[PDB]
Design a protein around this ligand. Structure first.
Ligand SMILES: Cc1cn([C@H]2C[C@H](O)[C@@H](COP(=O)(O)OP(=O)(O)OP(=O)(O)O)O2)c(=O)[nH]c1=O
Ligand SMILES: [Ca+2]
Ligand SMILES: [Ca+2]
Ligand SMILES: [Ca+2]
Ligand SMILES: [Ca+2]
Ligand SMILES: [Ca+2]
Length: 895
DNA sequence: CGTAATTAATTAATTG
DNA sequence: AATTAATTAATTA
């Protein structure tokens, strides 16, 4: 097998590399890498190195990395461009791995761990690490074992050994319910004192040094805590042994009185799973406790205990250790499902960056582009300083607020990267400019044809057609990868719905789930077999389909983010190929494409239909159009339909056979009009939406831009077994909306679109009757807590203090002089509740850290002073008022 | 050190 | 309540 790197670092004039060799064995080497950079040279100098603009460059080979770096500084001061990859580890990696990397994950040491620290005086700050580490569980991917380091004796208590027997038993049975599938994988090690525990953990770490270090919050708690505790007890050089090169860097953050740190461990790539989850999951969560995320992703129960966590070891060491192990295993479970580590390795190795650089689209693209250009013996430009400037983006149509009964939407395939490729937008493909007519004139095809020679964008930019830009070239490759995974995801999704259909009529038999790969559409033979399966076999198959869909979702949506990020990167001053003309070309072409196709669809739909000048396109946003289908249904006649699936079939056929071909012809004209390099504006039907046939449901509605709801029966080829609500922007979608309110408003929308006005009125009353009985957490608002210090005036709200900060300031006054009540962390999320006037908290609202029961000392008071009336009006009634007024409905029977 | 467009909620001040 | 502006948070794309 071909070699691949694990980690790369620059220490002085040396590159330190851990790698897998041709026999699949982990190795380390130190290389005195001699880098190269380039300067522009007179034409009269024969060479093989040119910049992206085809200007001649001469290579300077340096004795070592410091002198290359020194050369750059020198070139800045003179004002002469120093060209080349100035990040030397990428340059090194590009030389040492002169090929598409094929990697083997089973050889990569992936490690997650977490630690427990008992603290009788509040949060144990990693920067002081003054309390003993009393448990560590460290899972090693290569061994596939959980190494459990348990402290038996501590200042805060001497405890008995942990029983794997009791651990294994379910909680019903008085056990700890450690999943049976990992029981046999636990290697348990108790210790007499903290010193040998830590010493043994160090040697262990030396034997089994992580390449990928992960876990939950490990970068901000576990890593810095372990590092500092070992430092205090043993000394810094001993703590440096966590780096396989005995080098670390401590980053210090703020913070008036507060101080937290982040350790960089040279020779390891840290991918904190919270950070992976925030970047790659495409959710926004009310809370980021592992308990909250585990429940969300895996549907597992919260890790319940009695007393505060600072007394859990003391009172129930057994559960203390079991919960430590499970916590570690839950992250593993989440990744088994989400597959983010895998995604990181894929992207990292494709780009030839340090794996931890996947968090950075700019860094990622810089390497991809560098490698792509290096292969052709071309030289990359030097990074330049730019001022930050606002620039124009997408077009959003103003909709008429209303109910819309039948709606078909259409959306463009991967729009921005498609524009990049169609127009040939790249730093080196710029050809010139033309005189700019109003966008409106290009939309209406009345403006003069910009160029007969070059590929054009309505912002005035012209690009060469006769060669390919590095940006179109490299975005195309990732796009194709994205396309493949999306294919796998949609088939998995379609397969899911087939299984869902089959669950309506489950057969009474004893059978097994079928052995199938879900990334592929079921064969007819398979579909026949599915119709004779039992619910048990069907339900298990469904779970597997859904799991396959999720993996395909991860793979496709993150590749989409990467490619869409290149379009954005053109507008970030830190990107080497930053150019606002190129960013503008993309967005302005986009604005044209959408409005252009709006005109074309209306024109078409007026011809068929036999109408004159009706606006069929009700709404659009960036790359999408929403088409009122009422008149399409009208022509054939609503009474002509047997059931819902009949008119859904009808519209589906009409879009596929009539609309898409008319749209394609429309965009081919535009491409010719802009003289583009390649036609790639592909717009296909997305949603078919409407009320169930024969019902009083309204089907859908808009309140304004970026705010609507649709009852969808078919989504880009997936025919649902049950209609799904497509709700965008509305409070049902916002993480700041109370949990119970999100559900109530969703059922409200469901009744409106599927059942009608009378049904809505029934639910409203029922919810209102039950509101005061719901759990206070489920009805609390949520918000991020930024700038708490800015508005804190002696514990009281300063000028312009936001409601949610006011709440935090009310919290902080309530918990003064109290050690074991949890503190609100700057930047984190908080639950928020209104308080009735005359409350003893002295203010109108209170806030406490999200994902946690409010501390017992004031829970009783908060529950009693909650303003349910304000709460209901603010979070539930006001949003519904907006939905219903837009849809011309009443939530209460009007007098 | 991917982007812009857009909403809703809330504070301050003003609307004779 | 009802604006206009400014800030903050959170979406859609
Ligand atoms: C989601 C997203 C979209 N956009 C812009 C660029 C997209 O091409 C355009 C349309 O967004 P989308 O339609 O959401 O995505 P897409 O067209 O790029 O990909 P798909 O094939 O699944 O439809 O909006 C961003 O700039 N950043 C983003 O994060
Ligand atoms: Ca814990
Ligand atoms: Ca799209
Ligand atoms: Ca059946
Ligand atoms: Ca879209
Ligand atoms: Ca599509």
């Amino acid at each position: 097998m071909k070699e691949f790197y694990l980690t790369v670092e620059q220490i002085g004039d040396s590159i330190f590399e851990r790698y897998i060799d041709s026999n699949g064995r982990e190795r380390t080497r130190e290389v005195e890498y001699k880098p190269s950079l380039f300067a522009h040279c007179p034409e009269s100098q024969a060479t093989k190195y040119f910049d992206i603009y085809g200007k001649p460059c001469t290579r300077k080979l340096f004795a070592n990395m410091r002198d290359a770096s020194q050369w750059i500084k020198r070139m800045e001061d003179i004002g002469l461009e120093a060209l080349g990859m100035d990040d030397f580890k990428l340059a090194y990696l590009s030389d040492t791995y002169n090929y598409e990397i094929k990697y083997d994950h089973t050889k990569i040491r992936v490690a997650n761990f977490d630690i427990e620290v008992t603290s009788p005086d509040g949060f144990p700050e990693p920067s002081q690490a003054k309390h003993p580490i009393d448990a560590i569980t460290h899972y090693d991917s290569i061994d596939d074992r959980f190494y459990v380091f348990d402290l038996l004796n501590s200042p805060y208590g001497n405890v008995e050994e942990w029983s794997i027997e009791i651990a294994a038993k379910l909680q019903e049975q008085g056990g700890d319910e450690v999943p049976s599938e990992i029981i046999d994988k636990i290697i348990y090690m108790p210790f007499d004192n903290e010193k040998e525990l830590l010493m043994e953990y160090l040697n262990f770490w030396q034997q089994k040094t992580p390449v990928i270090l992960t876990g939950w919050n490990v970068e901000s708690f576990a890593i810095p805590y372990v590092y500092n505790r070992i430092k205090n007890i043993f000394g810094e050089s001993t703590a440096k042994r966590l780096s396989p090169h005995r080098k670390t860097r401590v980053k210090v953050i703020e913070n008036m009185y507060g101080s937290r740190e982040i350790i960089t461990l040279f020779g390891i790539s840290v991918l904190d799973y919270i950070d992976l989850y925030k970047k790659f999951s495409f959710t926004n969560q009310p809370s980021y406790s592992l308990d909250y995320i585990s429940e969300f992703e895996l549907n597992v129960g919260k890790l319940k205990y009695d007393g505060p966590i600072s007394k859990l070891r003391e009172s129930n060491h057994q559960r203390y250790i079991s919960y430590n192990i499970i916590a570690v295993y839950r992250v593993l479970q989440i990744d088994a499902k989400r597959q983010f580590i895998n995604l990181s390795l894929d992207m990292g190795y494709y780009a030839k960056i340090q794996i931890q650089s996947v968090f950075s689209p700019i860094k990622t693209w810089d390497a991809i582009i560098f490698n792509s250009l290096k292969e052709q013996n071309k030289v990359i430009p030097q990074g330049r300083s730019h001022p930050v400037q606002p620039y124009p983006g997408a077009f959003v149509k103003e909709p008429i607020p209303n109910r819309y009964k039948y709606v078909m939407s259409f959306d463009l395939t991967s729009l921005y990267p498609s524009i990049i490729r169609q127009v040939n937008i790249s730093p080196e493909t710029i050809a010139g400019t033309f005189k700019v007519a109003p966008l409106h004139d290009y939309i209406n095809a009345v403006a003069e044809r910009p160029s007969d020679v070059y590929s054009c964008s309505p912002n005035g930019m012209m690009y060469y057609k006769d060669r390919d830009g590095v940006v179109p070239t490299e975005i195309t490759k990732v796009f194709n990868q994205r396309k493949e995974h999306k294919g796998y995801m949609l088939a998995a999704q379609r397969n899911g719905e087939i299984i869902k259909e089959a669950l309506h009529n489950p057969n009474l038999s004893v059978d097994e789930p079928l052995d199938v790969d879900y990334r592929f559409d079921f064969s007819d033979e398979i579909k026949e077999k599915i119709k004779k399966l039992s619910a048990k076999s069907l339900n298990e198959m469904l779970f597997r389909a859904q799991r396959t869909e999720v993996a395909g979702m991860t793979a496709q949506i993150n590749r989409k983010l990467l490619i869409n990020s290149l379009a954005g990167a053109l507008g970030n001053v830190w990107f080497r190929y930053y150019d606002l003309r190129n960013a503008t070309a993309i967005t302005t072409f986009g604005q044209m494409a959408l409005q252009w196709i709006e005109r074309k669809v209306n024109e078409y739909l007026n011809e068929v239909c036999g109408t004159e000048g009706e606006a069929f396109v009700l709404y659009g946003d960036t790359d999408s159009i929403y088409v009122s289908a009422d008149k399409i249904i009208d022509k054939v006649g609503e009474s002509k339909f047997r059931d819902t699936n009949h008119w859904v079939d009808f519209l589906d056929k009409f879009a596929r056979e009539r609309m898409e071909p008319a749209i394609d012809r429309g965009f081919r004209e535009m491409c010719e009009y802009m003289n583009n390099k390649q036609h790639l504006m592909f717009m296909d039907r997305e949603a078919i939406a409407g009320p169930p046939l024969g019902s009083k449901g309204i089907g859908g509605f808009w309140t304004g831009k970026k705010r609507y709801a649709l009852n969808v029966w078919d989504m880009e080829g997936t025919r649902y077994a049950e209609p799904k609500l497509k709700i965008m922007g509305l409070e049902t979608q916002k993480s700041s909306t109370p949990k119970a309110v999100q559900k109530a408003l969703k059922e409200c929308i469901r009744r409106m679109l599927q059942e009608g006005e009378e049904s809505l009125q029934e639910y409203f009353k029922e919810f209102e009757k039950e509101f005061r009985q719901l759990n206070y957490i489920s009805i609390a608002s949520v918000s991020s807590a930024n700038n708490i210090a800015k508005y804190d005036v002696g514990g009281f709200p300063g000028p312009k203090c936001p409601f949610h900060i006011r709440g935090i300031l009310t919290y902080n006054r309530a918990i003064k002089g109290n050690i074991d009540a949890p503190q609100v962390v700057e930047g984190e999320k908080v639950y928020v509740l209104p308080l009735r006037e005359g409350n003893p908290f002295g203010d109108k609202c209170i806030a406490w850290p999200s994902g946690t029961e409010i501390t017992d000392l004031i829970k009783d008071d908060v529950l009693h002073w909650m303003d349910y009336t304000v709460l209901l009006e603010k979070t539930f009634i006001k949003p519904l008022e907006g939905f219903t007024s837009a849809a011309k409905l009443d939530y209460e029977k009007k007098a």
